[PDB]
Structures are given as C-alpha cells and as structure tokens.
Write a structure and sequence with these properties.
part of a larger assembly; 21 chains; A mainly alpha (96); B mainly beta (100); C alpha+beta (38); D mainly alpha (109); B: mainly beta; 9 strands; 0% helix; 57% strand; C: 38 residues; rod-shaped; Tape measure protein (chain C)
C-alpha cells in the first residue's frame, strides 16, 4: 500500500512516526507474501487491504509485540492472539 | 500502547530574584513534540480559596525516555506541571496536573 | 487451592496532635495565672 | 477568655471523630467493591461468592482493614498464567483515598 | 454504500471524521468482496448492508483494532473475536 | 415494520432519534431478508415481529455494535453474542 | 390474552405503561404463533398461558433486551438466554 | 389447589397479594396441564402438590421471572434454572 | 410422620410456625408418595424417615424455595439442587 | 448504552456586579434537548447548616460530544450543576449534582 | 424479591410555629399498608450525648412506586425516618433509620 | 448406638441437646437400614460405627441440612455433598 | 453451625437513684443456659485512661430466638455486654464486648 | 493401637481430651476392620499404623466432620474428601 | 495477602500560637510593674 | 533411618521434638513397608531415603494431616495431595 | 505449620511501689522454651518522641496451649510484649511487639 | 538483517543498547536457521523478515525471558508461549 | 557431585548451611540412583548435573517440602509438582 | 559458548556474578548434551545458541529454580513450565 | 529474581557532639557493591516546609543476607536511607527512601 492510506485510517496528520510505520508496512507485506503459495510473486490487489489492516493492528501493538497483556499506570490492554488469523480463512479458501 | 497524541515538553527555568528591580523573571525552554499516550481529559471541579476551577489530573506515557530536563508539558492545549515521573526499562510514565 | 486473599487498610495517627494540644493548653493556663494577679 | 474549654473538647472528642470517619469510609469501601466486582467480572461464570465475601473489621484503634475473603480473589485482582486481570479493589482504593483525605481535612478546616 | 448512511446510523452529524470513515468503508467493501466466490466481480445488493454494519463495528473499535480488551480509569471495552463471523455463515449459505 | 411500532415499545415519544431508528430498522430488514432462501422476495408477515425485536436489541446496543462488554463510569452492560440467534431456529424450521 | 391478566399478575394497577405492554403482548403472540406447526392458524388454548408468562419476562427485561447483564450504582441484573427455552420442549412434545 | 393452601405455606395472613397469587396459581395449573399427555384432561390429585410448590417458587421470584440473578442494595438472589425440573422426572416416569 | 418429631429435631419448642410445618410435611409426604411405583398406595415404613428429613431441609429453605442462593449484609445461604436426590437412589434400589 | 432520556443543557453566564444598583443578575443560555443516559434518581439526605435537603449526586452520558459551553443540566425535572466532565473518544460523561 | 413484609408509610407534615401559643404541632398523614421486602432487624448500640440507644439502620424495597409523598415508615413495629430513596425503573428502594 | 457414645465424641457433657441428638441418631439408623438389602432386618454391628460418625456430621450440620454453604457474621462453613458417601463403597462391597 | 458452647444470658435491670442513701443498686436477672456458637477468644490490648486491659470483642450465635429481655452474656467465664443483636429468620446473632 | 502413641505423635501431653481420642480410635479401628475382606477377623499388624494416621487426621478435623471448609475471621481450614482414600489402594493391592 | 494502605497523620503548628500567647504574657507583666513599683 | 539424618536436614539442633519425629519416622517406615510386595520383609536400602524425605514432609504438615490448605493469622500453607505420590512410580517400576 | 523456632515465654510480675525506697522492682518468671512458628523478622523505623528506633511487629504460633501465665516472649534474641493472644481449638496465636 | 532496520522499527535512535540487540539478532538468525530443513545452508530471503519481527519481540522481553508474567506496582506484562509459534506454520507450509 | 559446585551455583559463600546441603545432595543422589535401571550400580557421568540441579531446587524448597504454596506478609512461593519430572523423560529416552 | 556472549545479552558489565553464570552455562551444556542421541559427543554448533538462551532464562530464574510463582514485596514473577520445551521440537525434528 | 543492579551499602556512624568545637562530624563506612534487584525509579513531588523536592520511595532485594551493619544505600546514583529491612529465609528485602 501507500503509507498515506494507513496514515489516514489511524488519523495521523504529521511526519513524526513515518519511520516506524514504513517498517511495519514493509513487514506486513513480507509476511503476507510469505503466506501465499510459492508460485505467487506479488500480493494480488484483491488482498491489498489486509496489509493496511494489520499495519493498524501492529501500530496499536507497538511496544507490546510479544505480550498478551500490558498494564501501565492504570492503562490496560489485552491483545488478539494472531494478527492474520481472520485472513487465513480467506487466503486458503481463495487459492484452494 | 497506541502512541497517537503529540506532547510538547517544557522546562521553566527558575531565575534568581533581583531586588533592585523586584523581578524574578523565569525563562521557558521548550522542546520538539514527542509521540505520547494520554488518559482521557477530565475537567473536575477543584475548590480553591478564591473559588472553583476546572482541574485536570492525568497520566502521560512515552516510549523509552528523553535525554533532557523537563518540568511541564503542553498537550491538547492544556499546560500541566509534572508531579511524578516513573522510569521503566523501555517506557516512561509521567503523572501530570493542570496549572490553574 | 491457596488462600490468596487481598487486604486494604485505612488507619490514622492522633498522638502528635494530642501533644501539640497539651502544649497550647498549658501556654494558655500560663496566661490565666498571670491574669489572675492582674 | 474560656478558650481552655475549646481546647479541652478538641483533646477529648476528636478521637471519636476520626474513628467515625474511618468507619464510614471502610463501609463505603466494601459497598463500592461489591459493586465493582460485578462491574468487571462478567465473562459469565458469576455465582457472586466473591461478593458474598468482601468484608471489613476494626483491626486496631483508628485502624480498619477491608478484606476479600474468597480464596481465588487474588487471581482475579492480578490475573494469572491463563487469565487477564480484572482489578476490583484497586479502583476503589483510588476513590476511598480521596474521600478519606478530604473528609479528614473537613474535620479541621 | 454511501458514506452518508453509515454517518446517519452512527448519528455523527459533523465532518470531523470523514477521512477515517471513508477508509473504513473502503476496507469493509474490499474484505466482503474478498469473501465472495472467486468469479463474483460485484457485491450482491442483497449483502450491501453488511458493509454498513461492519463499518459501524469498526468505527466503535477505533483505537482497539488488535486489542481484545481495553481499559482505563473507569472506561472499559471488550471486543468480539471477528467482525464478519455472523456473516460468514450467511454468505456461505447464500452461495451453497 | 412501521417505525411507530418500534417507537412504541422502547417508550419513545419524540422525534430526536428517528434517523437512527430508521437505519436500524432498514438494516434489520435487510439482514432477515438475507437469511431466508434465495427465492424469497419479502419477509413474510409471519416473521414481521423479528424486525421489531431486533430493532429494539440494536437500539440498546447503540454505541457498542462490536463489543461484548461496555463499562462507562459505573454503568456497565454485557451483550448477547448474536441478535438473530433465537430466530434461526424458527426460520430454518419453517422453510425446512 | 387480555392485557388485564398480565397487568394483574405483575401487580401494575395504573395505566402508565399500557402502550408498552400491548406491544410486548402482540410480540409474544406473534412469536408463539411462529413456533407452531406451519398448518396451525391459531394458538391452542392449552398454550394460552405462555403468552402471559413470556410477556412478564419481557416486562422485566425492558431496557435489557439484547443484554445478558446490566449493572448500575446499587442495582444489577442477569438474564437467561432465551425466553421460550422452557416452552420449546413442551410445544415439541405436544405436537410430537 | 385452593389459594389458602399456598397462602398458609408462605406464611401470609392478609389479602393484599391475592390478585397476584391467583394468577400465579392459575399459570402453574395451566403449565402442569401442558406437561401431561394430550389425553389427560385434569392434573391428577397425585400431583396436586406440584402446583403448590411452584406457586411458592414463583412467589419468591416475583419481579425476576426472567433473571438468573437479582441484586438490589446489598440483597442478592440467584434463581433455579427451571421451576418444574424436579417434577419432570416424576411426571414422565409416571406416565411411561 | 407426626409433626412433633420434626418439631423435636429442629429444636423448635414454641408453636409459632406449626401452620407452615404442617404444610411442609403434607407436601413432602405427597412428593414421596409420588416417587413410589404406581401400584403402591402407602409409603413403606422403611422410608418414613425421609418425610422428616426433607421437611427439615425445607424448613431451612423457607424464603428460598426457588433460589439457588440468598445473600444479605453478611448472611448467605447456598442450596443444594434437589431435596430428594439422595433418596431417589435408595427408593430405586429398594424397588429394583 | 441505551440513550433514552432527554437532557437540556444550560450555561449560566456570570454577570459583572454593578455597584450602582447592587445587582449581579446572571443570564441563562439554554439549549435544545439531547438524548442521554443517566443513573437512577437518588434523593439522599444532605445536611446543610440550615437543615436537611434532598440531594442527588449522579452521572449522565452522551454519545460523541457537544460543540458548545455548558454549566448546568436540567433532566427529569431536576436541575444539576456539572462538577466533572470526562471526555472519551466517542462518548462524554458528566458528573452532576443537584442544586439545592 | 420476596415481598412478604407489610410497611405502613407516613408523612409527618410540618406546621408553622405559632408564637401566640409557643406550639408547632405537626400532623401525621398515614397510608394503607404496602407489601415490601426488608433487611433483617439490627439493634446496634448508638451512643448519643445522653447515653446509649438501640438504633436500627436498614433498607426497604417495594415493587414499582407510590404516587404519594412520604417521610417515615412503620414496619415490624419500629418507626423509621427515610434518609434516602432510590428510584429504579420497576423498583423503589428506601434507606431508613429508626427514630430514637 | 447408645447416645452416650456419640455424646462422648462431640465432647458434650450436659443434657441440653439430647432431644435433638436422639432424633438425629434415630434418623441415621433408619437411613442406614434403608441402604442395606431388603432381607437385612438390623444393621450388623460390623457397621455400627457409621451411625455414630454420621450422627456427628449431622450434629455439625444442624441448621444447614439443605445447604452447600452457610455464612453468618464472619463464620463460614461449606458442607460435604453426601453424609454416607464414603460408606456406600463399604456397604456395597460387603454385600456384593 | 455446630452449637457446642453454653451461654448464660443476663439482664442487668437499672434501678432508680435513691438520693436519701446515695445508692442506685441494680439487680441482675439471670437465665438458664442456652446452646450457642461463638468465635475463638481474643485477648486484645485495649488502652484506657488508667492503662492496659485485656479486652475481647466477639460474636455469638443461637438458633431461632429467645422470648426474654437480655443485656449481658456470661460464657467461657467471661462476661460481655451485648452491643448489637441481629435477627435473621431462624437464627439470632449477638455482637458482644467484654466488660472491663 | 495404644492411645499413648497417637497421643505422642500429636504431642498432646495432658489428659484433657482422652475421652474424645478414645472414641476416635475406636472408630478408626472399626472402619478399617470394615474395609478388610469379609473373612478377615483381625486387622493385620502390617496395617496397624493406619489406625494411628487416620486418628490424627480426625483429631485435626474435630468440629468439621461433615464440612469441606471452615473459616472465621482469619483462621481457615479446608479438608480432603476421604480420610482413607490413600489407604483403600494399599489394602486392595495387599489382598489382590 | 497483598495489603493496600491509606495512612492519615494529624498535625497542628502550635509553635506560632505559643509565641503569641507568651508575647501577650510578657506584655501584660509590664503593666503589673508600672502599677506597683 | 536414624533420627539424626532427618534431624540434620530440617535443621534441628535440640531435643524438644524427638518424640514426634520418632513416631513420624516409625509411621513412614510402616507405610513404605506396606507399599512393597507381600514377600518383602524390609525396606531395601535402595529406598531408605524415601523414609527421610516423607518424614520431612510430614514434619512440615504437623497439625494439618488432613487439610488441603491452612491459614493462621496471615500465614498460609497449601499441601500436596499425597506424600508418596512421586515414589509410587519408582517402587512399582522397580518390582515390575 | 512448621514449628521450627524455639520461643522462651516470660511473665514480668508487677511489684507494688515502695514509697520508703522509691522502688517498684518487678520480677521476671521465665519458662522453658517451646517450639513455635513465627513470621520473618521486620525492623521498621518507628518514630518516637526522642527519635528513630528499629521496631518489630510480628505474630507467633504454638500448637495447643500453655498452662501458665505469660506477658513477654524472647525469640530470635529479641524481647517482645504480647499485645494479643488468640485461642483456637488446637492452636494458640500471639500478636507480639518488640520492647524499645 | 541489518541492525539498523530493527533499530528503526523499535524507534530506538541512540546507541545505548546495540550490544544487546546485536546478540538478540544473532540469536534469532541462529534459531531460524535451525528450524529450516537440514540441507538448507541459508535463510531464504522470503523469510528475512522473521528475524526482525522476533528480534523486536525479544527486545520487549528483555528481563523476562524465562517468565510467563512480570509485575511490579502497576507495571505488568504477560508474554505469549513461544516467539516463533506463528512462523512454525509458515516455514512448514513453505517446505511442504 | 562436590558440595562446592552446588555451593557456587547458589552463590552461598559462608558455611552456615553445609549440614543441610550435604543431606540434600545425599538425598538427590540416592533418588537418581533409584530411577536408573535395576542393574546400573553407578550414576552415569552424563547425568551428573541432575544431582546439582535438583539440589538447588530443594535448597529453595527448604521449609516447603510437602507444600504446593507458602505465603506470609506478601512473601509467596508456589512450587512445581515434581522435582525430577523434567528428567524422568531424559533418563527414559537414554535407556530406551 | 563463551561466558562473554551470555554476559553481553543480559547487559552485565562487571565480574560480580561470574561464578554463578559459569555454573549455569556448564549445567545448560550438560543438559543439552543429555538430550542429544547417545552417539553424539558434542553439541553441534548449529544448536550453540540454545546454551546461551537457556543460560539467560536461568539467570532470570535464579533463586526460583523450582517455583512457578514468586512474589517478594510487590515484585511478582511467574515462570515457564520447562526451559527447553521450545527447543525439544527442534532437536527431535533434526535428528529424526 | 533477576539480580542485575549493583548496590553500594553504607553505614553512617554517628559521632558524639563535641561542645568545645560545636561539631558532631559523623563518619561513613562504605562497602563493596552487591548484586541486587530494585523497583523502577520514581521521582514524586514531596512537599516540605521549604518547598518541593523530587523524592523516591522504593524497595531493594538481595539474595541471602549481609554480615555487616548498614544504614544507607547508594544505587542508580541516588542515596537512600533504609527505613525497613525484612529478613526472609533465603532473601533480604530493604525498604528505602531517598535523602532530600
């Protein structure tokens, strides 16, 4: 995806986090392209939104990439077990 | 943590009182804005000797830590005095109260 | 099982205030005794 | 001129004024915790036996101790190796602290 | 869908969040169009409401995309595991 | 349904929420008409009450469409897993 | 049923809520008539009490239609999963 | 049953709740007569006590007919899942 | 049984509750006589104690007949699910 | 949240005291009613210097937020002063106390 | 709730003091008894200026609500002042304390 | 058994509870004699201790005969599910 | 509840002061012992104006209820003043404190 | 066993409780002798220790015979379900 | 057993009041001297 | 074993608990010799350490021999379900 | 409970003041050591009128009970005053505070 | 990977922790290269992102490697079972 | 092992506890030698570390041998069920 | 491994814990060499990182080698069930 | 417990006041650094008579125990007074407060 399309959803309006979001998006693209069959060279645009959605999930998770729960001075988060879990049922169902 | 909000740190640097001019003009150092995470805004009734004011007691969170001295923060257009700062390994957490 | 109970406790100290009040009392009794001769 | 009577009364009675405010805040702590438990413990297994077992006692002079007597309650307050935390006494600590301090101030303001 | 019908349902009368809602809707449309059979180039109008419903779910979830629960100082949310779970069954039953 | 019949049950007596209830009712009708067999063109009046009942459920859930629980300053709610769950047993049993 | 017999059971002697109770009763009648065999045009008088019983259940649930629990300062409720669950078995056993 | 026999067990000694107890008893009789086989026209006196016992259970439950649990200013109740549950094993075992 | 032997066991030396205990005993006798084989017109004296035991159970349960649990201001009760559960097995084993 | 109840917001606008007439007559701005959610009514004994009064300390909840300044609410026919306002992302929550 | 106990409501109607006779004789309005539910009786030591008294602080519950003004209740042969009343949708809950 | 042998174990040294203990012991004897095979006319002395042990269990349970749990002003008890449970394994194993 | 312990109830009946003899000799009515259940004995330090004493605050429980007026109990050879009595349906619970 | 060896193990050097311990020991002996094969008139000396061990268990349980848990104001016990459970297996394995 | 605690410790700054009353005493004594001497 | 070898591990350095430890050790020896096959006349020295280890377990458990958990004035213990459990897997594996 | 630690009980027997010699010399009775169980040692700051001291507030537990009167314990080389003693059926529990 | 890309993702702009991150990355590379088929001498560039992702997980876990949860004074972490669990499936599916 | 290597690992530089550690080590050696095949007269040096590891486990468990958990004044331990369980598998796999 | 490579990861910069870390590393090397097949004489360098990683796990766990939970004055730790469990799968999958 | 941080213990040895020179100069004994575990640093507002200071209330943990007397610790470059020390079987835990 563009960075701007992720940037819009999470409501950001400045440059101060671009270097993280760039690496997050680049990681999501690498992972999704790892899940497709070996012959697939590119994520088909049919799935491009996944790269955005997980990029937002990871943006929220930042500073908690391994953690199931996170409490910091009364702020408490609990995290979904697997970012791509919903999409495995789409990817597999599409190629098979 | 989602670190969405932007905080401006400040140091209000305390000057020595000048008895020849009856002034002790402080000076503000002010820093570039940092990505942070902050509690929802409260506007509690606080009841001072002269009357009611809209106070805000709050907590603000930033990833890793900052090299430089600070004393106040400006965020959401409210200026706060830092009243505690709590230094975890990979994170810093500041207890902040509105001035006024 | 294990008895992993939780406590919270509220407690107060008055004994310092008690002695500060005794100190003020005897100072006013000093005034009383000099006013009696006046 | 009779000011010694006022200081004598302060010396004599303020012990009970503090004890009363402590007792009132202790009762309120239990009431609020009994509500807060059901406020967050709603994954759906509720018998409420926890809330049947939040109590307090005057464990010392000018000292009241609240206690959650249900054995598993720590596992709920702090979470576990398998569960997220659903803290229920901590959020009441944040309330009763403020009430206790401001009421003790109001005893002397 | 239009934006305006999601806007009407969530009762949001100003314009301060159209940039986010347009991305959310674009995402929901893309995902639903991913769940259809491979041949199907267009979302059947029979299903046009799902886009709106999930968009509202996602609007509520803003700031909790990857988080199963979220709490701070008197405010707590707990979220269901999969936005489309109710509709995976309907889409299946319609094509089978 | 009419709007008025839902309006009566939830005890409303003014106009200030009509634009939400209209979209809620319109969504419930679309969903129920998605659950019936493909040949069915209209919800049969035999089932019309379902559209009302779920319209009330959703009215309560407003602002919580994705959330298993919602706590706001000492009010707290927990929500049923699926609005139409009771009626699946009637709909299926009726057509089959 | 009459309204007056639901009214008598719930002990409600004024008229402030007849607009709601008449809709509740109309709803319960429609649902029960949906649970009968397809041929059966009329609710058997043997079952006429179910309408009343469920109407009272629903009267209590006013403001908690979709909610498995509600809590507020000093007061809280928890609700059973399905109003007609007790009677699905009786209706079955009577027709089979 | 007579009303008086229920009245005696719950220890009532005045008239102020008769119109509720009458409808409760009338509902219990209708339900039990729904559970017996179709050819049975009357509850046999062998079972008459059931109508009393459930009439007491429901008297306690009054104002909670759908609720698993009820908490009102430090008074908390939790209810049996089904009023006739014990007696299903007697009724069925008797006719079959 | 007599009343006086239930009275002796529960240690109740006054007469303030005989109206309730006589109904409780009459109820327990009717239920036990319902659990016997259909032919058996009389409760075997081998079982005469069960009437007394369950009556004491029920005496304790006064005000909680429909309730699995009761709680108030540091009093609490939890009730077993079925008064005759212990004895269903004995009655069975005796007749089989 | 079920947003059933209707609340009327108000701003009581504080006037400058006039020493020529010994008056400081305030003025009330009053707004169109908004759908809200509110706790059950309490009527507690509150014990003022002049005696007992029936007080009500309560919380009121509204979806998203309002553009305009407020200070009091009128709901259920009781008038309350706002003593805290807490501002979540999609929801606003007002702590309110009856006047008198 | 089991609504077994019977409560008698009362309103003690406050008269205006008469300086010609040094009396301010109140009058009691008293209503028909209502089915209610009430906590078990306490008889706590309360420690007044003149000495000990047997106090009872309690809660009483009634289905739906009553049309008419009230101030005291008589139940179990004890007379109480109402000190809070809490108005749920289908239920009313009164906090009550014995007088004396 | 004698009453005195139960009396000794529970440490009683006065007459003030004899009329309860007598009925408890008489009930335990009737129950145990209900558990043995139909041809057995008396509890064999080999089992006489059971009558004592259960009589002590019941003595502790007095005032809680139907209750799983009992809390009274900080004193809390939770009760075993069946007084004779241990002994069923002995009785059965002895006759069979 | 195991009701093992035996309690003796007492009523200390308050006499009217006799100014001719400067006496107000009370009289004790004392009742037959009742089976009860009681907390384990405490012997806390209590710190009076004249010094330390071994105090005992405790709770005592009896099945059903007693017909007759009471004020003190004697049990375990300790005499207590009753300071609260709590009247459940089938059970009575007395809060008791040692005298001295 | 002697009394004196149970006495020594539990460290009880006075005589204030011999009346209870003698009944407990007589009970444990009777139960163990009930668990042996029907022919066996005497407790094998190989098992003579079990009488002592269970007697100490029961000594600890005095006042909680029928209770799984017992608590008051900071003193709390919970008890294992069956004193002999450990030894049922050993007695079995020895005779089989 | 985790224990949360709230402590309240009560103070009065009587060191000012003492000085005030002592100043009053010492001031009054001047009068007594002026009268008698 | 010697007493001294148990004494050393639990860190005791005086005589004040010998009469308890002697009986504990004597009980452990009797039990372990109960677990071995009938032909075994003595615990083989290969297993002698077990008598020590369990003797320490029981020394800790003293005053709780039947209890799953124990709280006394802010001190809490919870106990393993069976002292010999680990060693059953060694004993059986050795003889069979 | 593991009853590892050994406690020495004491009774400090209070003598009557002798005005001819201005002495009230107490005498200590001291007993044979008993196996007990005790909390880990604390050494809290306690802030007396003359200054800081290392205080220790603790609990000590013994199996069954002791025949004889006591007032102080010596254990771990610290001397404590008994401030509460709680008497369970098979166990005795003493709350103790260091002297000084 | 480079260090600099892990550095960029975790937003760590100073150099105070390069000594730790270089060891973490060296560890993640070695482990991933251990999970490949035995023949495979080089990490496929398709998987080069996993090294980075797990390195960030491990960076967050510094001081909690052996621990499922960590807490102090309202700072709390809970950690997932296995850093590579998400990727074990992808590596398998790629080679099979 | 030597004592000195257990001593080094647990960092214990004085001699105040050698009397306990020598007994602990003697116990661990005996147990491991009990877990080996019956023929094996000597602990293989491949396993010599297990003696040390379990000894440190036991050193930490001093005062909690039989206890699953131990707590006072907020100091709390919870212990794993079996010291050797990790190594039972290795010893098995080595001899099989 | 070298000690220095472990030292670097845990961020140590002085000598004050070398004698513990040396023994920890020596124990991990012995255990891992116990998990490999009997013919394997040395840990293959392919696995050398495991010795480092586990040495860190144990470093954290120091003073809690047998403990599942560990609370000390508000500092609360809880530990993984098995240090090697992740690597068990790699080791087995590599040799078999 | 991860014992990562290094603490330096100190004993400040109190000298006797010398009235001829008006000095009571203490002396510090200072020990070799020990591996310890410590809470994250706080820097709370503490509000003294002369004004605000950055205080730090904390807990520090060490394995087994130390032979020698101590009174203060220096760690993270902050000096603390020990205000409680808690002595478990295999672990020692010190409550510490910053000075100033």
């Amino acid at each position: 995806t563009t960075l701007a399309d992720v940037k819009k959803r999470i409501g950001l309006k400045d440059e101060k986090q671009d270097e993280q979001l760039e690496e997050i998006i680049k990681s999501c693209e690498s992972q999704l392209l790892s899940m497709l069959p070996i012959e697939v060279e590119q994520i088909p645009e049919r799935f491009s939104y996944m790269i955005k959605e997980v990029a937002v999930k990871r943006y929220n998770r930042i500073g908690a990439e391994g953690m199931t729960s996170e409490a910091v001075d009364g702020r408490s988060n609990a995290y979904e077990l697997n970012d791509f879990k919903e999409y495995e049922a789409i990817i597999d169902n599409y190629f098979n | 943590m989602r670190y969405e909000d932007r905080v401006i740190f400040q140091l209000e640097q305390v000057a020595t009182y000048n008895p020849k001019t009856s002034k002790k003009e402080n000076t503000l150092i002010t820093y570039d804005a940092i990505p942070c995470n902050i509690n929802p805004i409260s506007r509690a009734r606080k009841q001072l000797e002269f009357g009611d004011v809209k106070n805000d007691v709050s907590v603000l969170r930033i990833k890793e830590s900052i090299s430089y001295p600070v004393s106040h923060v400006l965020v959401n257009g409210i200026r706060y005095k830092i009243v505690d700062t709590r230094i975890y390994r990979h994170e810093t957490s500041y207890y902040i109260e509105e001035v006024n | 099982m294990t008895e992993y109970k939780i406590k919270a406790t509220i407690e107060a100290s008055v004994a310092k205030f008690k002695r500060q009040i005794d100190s003020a009392v005897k100072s006013v009794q000093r005034f009383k005794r000099v006013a009696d001769q006046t | 001129d009779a000011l010694l009577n006022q200081f004598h009364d302060m010396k004599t009675n303020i012990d009970d004024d503090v004890d009363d405010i402590l007792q009132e805040n202790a009762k309120e702590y239990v009431v609020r915790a009994k509500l807060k438990a059901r406020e967050v413990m709603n994954k759906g297994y509720w018998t409420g036996n926890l809330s049947r077992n939040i109590r307090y006692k005057k464990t010392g002079d000018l000292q009241y101790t609240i206690t959650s007597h249900a054995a598993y309650s720590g596992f709920l307050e702090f979470g576990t190796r398998y569960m997220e935390a659903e803290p229920f006494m901590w959020p009441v600590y944040e309330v009763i602290r403020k009430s206790t301090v401001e009421e003790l101030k109001a005893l002397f303001e």
